[PDB]
Amino acid sequence: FREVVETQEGKTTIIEGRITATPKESPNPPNPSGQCPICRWNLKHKYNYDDVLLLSQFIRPHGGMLPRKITGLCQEEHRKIEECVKMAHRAGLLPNHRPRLPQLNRYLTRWAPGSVKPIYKKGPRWNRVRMPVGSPLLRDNVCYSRTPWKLYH
Amino acid sequence: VKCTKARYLKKKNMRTLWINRITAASQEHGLKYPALIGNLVKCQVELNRKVLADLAIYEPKTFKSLAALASRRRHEGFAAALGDGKEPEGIFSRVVQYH
Amino acid sequence: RGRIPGRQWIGKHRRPRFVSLRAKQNMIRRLEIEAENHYWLSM
Amino acid sequence: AGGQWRLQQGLAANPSGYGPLTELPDWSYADGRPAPPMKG
Amino acid sequence: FKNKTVLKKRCKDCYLVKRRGRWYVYCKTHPRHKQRQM
Amino acid sequence: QEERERNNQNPWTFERIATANMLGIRKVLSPYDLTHKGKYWGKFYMPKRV
Amino acid sequence: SYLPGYVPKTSLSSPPWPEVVLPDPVEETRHHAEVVKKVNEMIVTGQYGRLFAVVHFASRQWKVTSEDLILIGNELDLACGERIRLEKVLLVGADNFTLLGKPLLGKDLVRVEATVIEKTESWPRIIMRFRKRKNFKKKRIVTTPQTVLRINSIEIAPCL
Amino acid sequence: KFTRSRIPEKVFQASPEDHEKYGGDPQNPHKLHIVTRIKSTRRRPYWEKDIIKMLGLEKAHTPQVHKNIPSVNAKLKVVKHLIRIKPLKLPQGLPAEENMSNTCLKSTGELVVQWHLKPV
Amino acid sequence: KKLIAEGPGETVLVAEEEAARVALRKLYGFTENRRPWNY
Amino acid sequence: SSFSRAPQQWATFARIWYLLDGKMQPPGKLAAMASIRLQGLHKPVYHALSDCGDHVVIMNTRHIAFSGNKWEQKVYSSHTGYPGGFRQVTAAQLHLRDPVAIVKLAIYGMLPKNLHRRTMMERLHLFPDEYIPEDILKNLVEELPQPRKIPKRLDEYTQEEIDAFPRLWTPPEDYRL
Amino acid sequence: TYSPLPDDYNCNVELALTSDGRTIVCYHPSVDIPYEHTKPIPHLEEGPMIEQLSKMFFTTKHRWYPHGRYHRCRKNLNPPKDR
Ligand SMILES: [Mg+2]
Ligand SMILES: [Mg+2]
Ligand SMILES: [Zn+2]
Ligand SMILES: [Zn+2]
């Protein structure tokens, strides 16, 4: 990475960019012949929002998500983890990443709270307005229990 | 007329009541009722829901052995799920052959 | 709210009943043993 | 419960159908004599 | 302004976005091109 | 369509159950349904169906 | 360094339940026999007290002990005061151990003796089958035969 | 309208895949079909309910034997969807006259001639 | 530091005397789980 | 046993006081385990005629959380009796007005609709904060565990766990971040 | 060392089969409560009375009201005792 600073001198100003410590991965990829990281480490269907150790690696300090071209992820996976970090962002698991400056607990929330409207009336069983949980993207995760994931309550 | 068909209600009510009792004592020991009876019939013990419930009332030490007997069969069954054959069968999963 | 026209099981519009995996698992068991039957009463 | 398991080994799905749970004599004399067969 | 199920960008300046729970379409050069999702 | 019905993992289709009638389904069905197997329902057409 | 199938620690990396391992069978066989023989000499020495028993009779189970009454909804063709030895027992248990079968226990292991004391005609159970606005009604009174048994005593054999 | 459904005979032609599955060798075919009813007689045409009564399977969970011949095959074919079919096989030879009483059925379709009622 | 008997009760006094009763039964051998009278 | 008649019968059908911490738990799962403990289903001697129910105490009902947008989606509706008395309030607004409310009407649906309902409801106790009177805090028995594990935060994850977890990909140096 | 359940609250449980493998036996002596797991020992009217005892017994006020003579006479005066 590189850090840029804009310094303040009297009647002048200087902009300069310096290189910082470049982290790296471990020297033992478990699964070679993998183009994306989930295939190189076998995390294709065995991750979620709660295991935030890898999610912190695919974000910015303010809370911005990295691009696919520089990270090198699949299209299906790139849209998966950008969802999972949004679940973690709304859940409040990364309080140090509050973006830039000059009330209630919450978790497992697909959409944003402000934009979502209430349901003043729920229809009958055959037209019940059931609320959503998670997303259709992470449905492919292996379910250790026998019954499947209930995405809509 | 209500006295006649109430017998089938007496059967269903008392039957389902025993399910709640055995489901309760199992949860106290750390198991659930569907897995419980599955291990019992797998381990060849034909104890109906009356005595199975009533046993939990007066000797929880015995019902703990039934639960411990049941939980061990689950691990034997899961070990069988990993490898069906090609292994030594479970010691308690061994069956008696009548003829 | 949520009523339906007339009776619940007949007519131009009725309650739309839907399937459960229980009933699916039940009926496949009945026709797969019938496939076991189909093998045996042959030959 | 367990009916599918019992027929896997060849036993009756209902244990009351056949097997030692019912076919044996349900009572005998205290002196060891054999009781008569049951109607069932 | 106008509501409409399917959206269509009339001109290049038209851009569609997701805002407060619905699909909107805004155009600064042609304000009449605005189109809400229904 | 012809490769989907050839490569389908479901071993059960309208052809087998209808011609053999393993559960007495010919009651609910029509005789025209034997040639209108699964795709059709009155005038409609379900290309997703197989 | 890492196995190809290895995965880092996450919530879905491993199952939620804890991993377990069963003991080896050889020492278990010596454990199966050792715990049995100390119980065998326990009952021979007579450390136990009461002993309850479960019984399959008349197509239904009962939890029973000694000096306890029990009823059956039919006649056995036994004269009053006669004793009988019951064959089927699912399990019998004492204060500190239990003897469960597969499904029942052996004949030589137990000897459950019970006396027949009393026989009633059941109290009059009335039944009425009725249907509405069609003049369908009927009555019937049954007095089924009943017999009262009592388990006089239960004992166990040293054979095991 | 609904009528009696004629079945193509080609359906009842076992392929090698079916042979390896059910273990039924085509040569040396079995002789007798153990039949048992599961589906109710109700909500079925008049020809379906009287045939199963003509076969004598009004009672459910009651094993009853029939022949493996083309004539009786037509009967339980049209009402095949009301019953289970299982073949008859025995290691201990036909039931002798001395062992007529001590017979016993099994869930695997076996019919043991001897039944002494205790394990090995 | 070794137990002999345990007894429930409404209050501490009722539980104390009940636990005293529990010990007296097993001390004299009149427990409810004792050998019934043989015949 | 060797217990007397009345003391033994008393200890069997006696009541007990459970305790539960509602920090980062859903109102349903704590209601599910609570409701079965209110009738006394956990007792193997259960019978509906015998009121063998047990008390339950909840804490941190303010610090609860749903799974989904049910803070906004869910609506709790009631009718006073007059015309226009039908009103609706979101779970968020209802929480701001009464943090004790969400659980008490949530359990209210779980347990059956009998006359034993209101007896078991008042037997249950609720507190928004972890501050309890000494009277009801002293007569405790056991604190049953929570249904769901609470996920840890980045500040909570120790360093040895992060070091044990392997970094996955190489970032090119030519990147602002 | 492996155990199916924690043997620290009810009884020390261990299962055992005869060498032939036809019967199962169990040995479950009850646990001994350690000394460390212990502690040392140390008018009004209808309205106010019905509510204060309800708050005392943790129950409702309905059952405390008096019933009619219809139910008082139907109550059995010689109920049977078991054991
Ligand atoms: Mg039933
Ligand atoms: Mg209507
Ligand atoms: Zn991949
Ligand atoms: Zn425009």
Swiss-Prot record, chain B:
One of its GO terms (biological process) is mitochondrial translation. Disulfide bonds: none annotated. Its main location: mitochondrion. Keywords: Mitochondrion, Ribonucleoprotein, Ribosomal protein, Transit peptide. The keyword Transferase does not apply. It is found in: Mitochondrion. GO terms for molecular function: RNA binding; rRNA binding; structural constituent of ribosome. One of its GO terms (cellular component) is mitochondrial inner membrane. Belongs to the bacterial ribosomal protein bL20 family. Component of the mitochondrial large ribosomal subunit (mt-LSU). Mature mammalian 55S mitochondrial ribosomes consist of a small (28S) and a large (39S) subunit. The 28S small subunit contains a 12S ribosomal RNA (12S mt-rRNA) and 30 different proteins. The 39S large subunit contains a 16S rRNA (16S mt-rRNA), a copy of mitochondrial valine transfer RNA (mt-tRNA(Val)), which plays an integral structural role, and 52 different proteins. Interacts with OXA1L. This is Large ribosomal subunit protein bL20m.
Swiss-Prot record, chain E:
GO terms for molecular function: structural constituent of ribosome. Keywords: Mitochondrion, Ribonucleoprotein, Ribosomal protein, Transit peptide. It is found in: Mitochondrion. It comes from the Eukaryota. The keyword Ribosomal protein applies. The keyword Hydrolase does not apply. Its main location: mitochondrion. One of its GO terms (cellular component) is mitochondrial inner membrane. GO terms for biological process: mitochondrial translation; translation. Transmembrane segments: none annotated. Component of the mitochondrial large ribosomal subunit (mt-LSU). Mature mammalian 55S mitochondrial ribosomes consist of a small (28S) and a large (39S) subunit. The 28S small subunit contains a 12S ribosomal RNA (12S mt-rRNA) and 30 different proteins. The 39S large subunit contains a 16S rRNA (16S mt-rRNA), a copy of mitochondrial valine transfer RNA (mt-tRNA(Val)), which plays an integral structural role, and 52 different proteins. bL36m has a zinc binding site. Belongs to the bacterial ribosomal protein bL36 family. This is Large ribosomal subunit protein bL36m. It comes from Homo sapiens. The lineage of its organism: Eukaryota, Metazoa, Chordata, Craniata, Vertebrata. The chain holds residues 66 to 103 of 103 of the full protein.
Curated annotation (Swiss-Prot), chain H:
Signal peptide: none annotated. GO terms for molecular function: structural constituent of ribosome. Component of the mitochondrial large ribosomal subunit (mt-LSU). Mature mammalian 55S mitochondrial ribosomes consist of a small (28S) and a large (39S) subunit. The 28S small subunit contains a 12S ribosomal RNA (12S mt-rRNA) and 30 different proteins. The 39S large subunit contains a 16S rRNA (16S mt-rRNA), a copy of mitochondrial valine transfer RNA (mt-tRNA(Val)), which plays an integral structural role, and 52 different proteins. The keyword Ribosomal protein applies. Belongs to the universal ribosomal protein uL30 family. It comes from Homo sapiens (Human). Keywords: Mitochondrion, Ribonucleoprotein, Ribosomal protein, Transit peptide. Its main location: mitochondrion. It is found in: Mitochondrion. The lineage of its organism: Eukaryota, Metazoa, Chordata, Craniata, Vertebrata. GO terms for biological process: mitochondrial translation. The keyword Ribosomal protein applies. The gene is MRPL30. This is Large ribosomal subunit protein uL30m.
Curated annotation (Swiss-Prot), chain K:
GO terms for molecular function: RNA binding; structural constituent of ribosome. Keywords: Mitochondrion, Ribonucleoprotein, Ribosomal protein, Transit peptide. One of its GO terms (cellular component) is mitochondrion. The keyword Isomerase does not apply. The keyword RNA-binding does not apply. It is found in: Mitochondrion. It comes from the Eukaryota. GO terms for biological process: mitochondrial translation; translation. Component of the mitochondrial large ribosomal subunit (mt-LSU). Mature mammalian 55S mitochondrial ribosomes consist of a small (28S) and a large (39S) subunit. The 28S small subunit contains a 12S ribosomal RNA (12S mt-rRNA) and 30 different proteins. The 39S large subunit contains a 16S rRNA (16S mt-rRNA), a copy of mitochondrial valine transfer RNA (mt-tRNA(Val)), which plays an integral structural role, and 52 different proteins. Belongs to the mitochondrion-specific ribosomal protein mL42 family. This is Large ribosomal subunit protein mL42. It comes from Homo sapiens (Human). The chain holds residues 35 to 142 of 142 of the full protein.
